[PDB]
Design a binder for this molecule. Structure first.
Ligand SMILES: Nc1ncnc2c1ncn2[C@@H]1O[C@H](CSCC[C@H](N)C(=O)O)[C@@H](O)[C@H]1O
Length: 245
């Protein structure tokens, strides 16, 4: 399981970008120095640092891979945010946060591990009423897509769905769909697939012969191809939800 190692040599493990994280932040108007924030599936904490540098309050990143949490705190350290930004090895399906105690729950390209609707449901219980939930998720841009891309997505994440369905689910889960925007293509190509280029040459050689590596490179190269060919039918959408009642 060196899948981790590879992604340690990258700015982020999923589509995204500073402008996008900030643009989504632009919709949350309840934050102060007393706000408790959580970023679920924070990976190395790249978006978590950009976030921490533009909002007040303490943030808690949570990720399944210890390797990412280690880089998370080390990076937090260099940036001096270690006081108000702590990394923690945990799982989104088994959180220990006091009920209705958070003001903001962040999650970029990580909610698929637990499921869109499931997350909306469960995480809700850790939010102060009027609190926010911001997550980026894979979506279909249309009601019709080719078979290649469709079955590819039915093999990885079956919950991918259209923006309209995602939105109603948010309303159904007891939130107000405050803001919803689709991510620019440069979030995949520029900030995700490209950085993955250099990473590979170095990774592959450091681990020459590792069967897992030779294939990881193949998975990434296949995803990039599907994207460069079907980018018009799918991508990521960011959702800012405000807990009801
Ligand atoms: N059950 C789980 N609980 C918490 N994190 C998990 C998890 N399953 C997977 N993850 C993490 O979810 C992240 C998905 S990749 C996205 C990483 C980061 N949010 C970014 O945008 O760069 C990875 O860090 C993966 O390790």
């Amino acid at each position: 399981n060196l899948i981790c190692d590879f992604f340690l040599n990258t700015e982020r493990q999923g589509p995204g970008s500073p402008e996008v994280t900030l643009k989504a932040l632009s919709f949350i108007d309840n934050l102060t120095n007393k706000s408790l924030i959580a970023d679920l599936g924070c990976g190395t904490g790249g978006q978590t640092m950009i976030l921490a540098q533009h909002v007040p309050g303490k943030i808690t990143g949570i990720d399944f891979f210890p390797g990412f949490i280690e880089r998370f705190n080390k990076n937090a350290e260099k940036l001096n945010l270690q006081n108000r930004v702590k990394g923690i090895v945990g799982s989104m399906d088994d959180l220990s946060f006091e009920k209705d105690s958070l003001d903001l729950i962040w999650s970029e390209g990580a909610i698929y591990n637990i499921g869109f609707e499931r997350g909306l449901k469960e995480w809700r219980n850790y939010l102060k009423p009027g609190g926010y939930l911001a997550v980026s998720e894979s979506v279909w841009f249309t009601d019709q897509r080719p078979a290649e891309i469709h079955d590819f997505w039915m093999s990885a994440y079956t919950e991918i769905d259209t923006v309209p369905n995602k939105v109603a689910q948010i309303q159904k889960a007891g939130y107000i769909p405050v803001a919803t925007f689709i991510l620019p293509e440069n979030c995949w190509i520029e900030h995700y697939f490209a950085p993955q280029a250099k990473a590979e040459e170095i990774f592959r050689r450091k681990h020459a012969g590792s069967r897992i590596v030779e294939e990881l490179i193949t998975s990434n190269h296949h995803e990039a191809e599907l994207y460069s060919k079907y980018k018009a039918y799918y991508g990521y959408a960011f959702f800012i939800c405000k807990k009801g009642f």
